[PDB]
Design a binder for these strands. Sequence first.
RNA 1: UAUAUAAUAGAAUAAGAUAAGUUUUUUUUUUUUUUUUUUUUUUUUUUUUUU
Length: 64
Amino acid sequence: TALDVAMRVNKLKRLHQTKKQVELDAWRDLNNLTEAQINSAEGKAVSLLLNSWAYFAKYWEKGA
RNA sequence: UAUAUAAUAGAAUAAGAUAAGUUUUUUUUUUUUUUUUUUUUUUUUUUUUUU
């Protein structure tokens, strides 16, 4: 589901906050999501993914 | 070993038309003019009585 990947990416982002190439990790999870998970995900997971997305994209090489 | 906090100000002063919701004597006083009645006075005519 989406809640578990959201929590794992949140933990990885928090550990990053407290880093070389680590941004590749927890970015594969964002590329992991399929539609069927999204059509039934709750809003808590969505907010977590959005926050993690922004925090990662602060330092991404190219694109977002 | 944590995912999260939030607060500063000031003024004294007025325009103005909408086709609407009562009615319950009429009379008193003063003056002038005309008409009618009564009383008083004067003049004329007629009749009666007295000198």
